[PDB]
Amino acid sequence: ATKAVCVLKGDGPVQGIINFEQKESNGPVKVWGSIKGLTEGLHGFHVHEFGDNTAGCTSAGPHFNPLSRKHGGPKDEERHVGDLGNVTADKDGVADVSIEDSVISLSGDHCIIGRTLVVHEKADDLGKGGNEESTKTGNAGSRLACGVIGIAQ
Amino acid sequence: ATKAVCVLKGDGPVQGIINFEQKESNGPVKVWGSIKGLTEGLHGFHVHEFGDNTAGCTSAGPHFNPLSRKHGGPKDEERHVGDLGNVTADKDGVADVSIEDSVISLSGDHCIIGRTLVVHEKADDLGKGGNEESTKTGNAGSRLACGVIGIAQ
Ligand SMILES: [Cu+2]
Ligand SMILES: [Zn+2]
Ligand SMILES: [Zn+2]
Ligand SMILES: [Zn+2]
């Protein structure tokens, strides 16, 4: 009963469509879709703070982090709201995304509408990498594609 | 949010960046920026309902109209929330946009974050066209460029 969508675009072409559905405001968000053009393996997948793509994906700023916590994986209590972990691409470069997440929302203060979804070059280390960057970004490298999350029918 | 931004893109030469700022809750929204690639003259300018660009600008749906009103211009009481009138391009194809609007908002029920800004082929007739489409769409013709309105820093 609330729906959102994001068209991911980046050089490659890396491209995909990601859908979001939340049946009630107190429930989880289902995230699903497909991304093509990726190298085989895990790729970091995050909601970033700003829905600003004026200079490409860099303009999206840091991870969406309304509670000012450290970076983690989606299962961790200490995580950014935008920490959705990794997506996995197969040998053909396609990632079939299927996530349920209870921390993001399509309404209220953890709302991700109007923010940027980003898929990364490298895997997110989920804050377990033991360098400074691990608990900020997860070391997921460059931003390969992004889009602004919009309200859907 | 107090600031928002939209990058307008389409299949042709029309592109631009539009900024939004609302200093006070329920206060006016300043709308400003530049659009290039346009034919000289007026071009309709609207917020459409969905932030869905999966098949380009057509996917954005109808005018944003939460109050179930007829189509009008920005200075009319009878208007859709998304009715921002026309932008004017010069011979070089550049429209410098500078609007203040108090019907749109960057929060609450009239919030435009996560919806689509669209610039059109033709002028919007502001509901004065005397055909049935005038009070629905304004007869502004094709959608030349669009983008999702995102949260800005
Ligand atoms: Cu329009
Ligand atoms: Zn990221
Ligand atoms: Zn993070
Ligand atoms: Zn209208």
UniProtKB/Swiss-Prot annotation, chains A, B:
Alphabetical GO biological process terms: action potential initiation; anterograde axonal transport; apoptotic process; auditory receptor cell stereocilium organization; cellular response to ATP; cellular response to cadmium ion; cellular response to potassium ion; determination of adult lifespan
Cross-link (1-(tryptophan-3-yl)-tryptophan (Trp-Trp) (interchain with W-33)): 32
Mutagenesis / variant outcome for changing residue 46 to R: In ALS1; 80% of wild-type activity; ubiquitinated by RNF19A
Consequence of substituting residue 83 to A: Loss of zinc binding and enhanced tendency to form aggregates
Outcome of mutating residue 16 to S: In ALS1; sporadic young onset
UniProt keyword Ubl conjugation, yes or no: yes
Broadest EC class assigned to this enzyme: oxidoreductase
Main location: cytoplasm
Outcome, altering residue 80 to S: Destabilization of dimer and loss of zinc binding
MF terms in GO: copper ion binding; identical protein binding; protein homodimerization activity; protein phosphatase 2B binding; protein-folding chaperone binding; small GTPase binding; superoxide dismutase activity; zinc ion binding
N-acetylalanine modifications at: 1
Matches recorded under PANTHER family: SUPEROXIDE DISMUTASE CU-ZN -RELATED
Protein's job: Destroys radicals which are normally produced within the cells and which are toxic to biological systems.
Subunit-structure text: Homodimer; non-disulfide-linked. Homodimerization may take place via the ditryptophan cross-link at Trp-32. Heterodimer with SOD1. The heterodimer CCS:SOD1 interacts with SLC31A1; this heterotrimer is Cu(1+)-mediated and its maintenance is regulated through SOD1 activation. Interacts with DAOA; the interaction is direct.
Protein name per UniProt: Superoxide dismutase [Cu-Zn]
Origin species: Homo sapiens
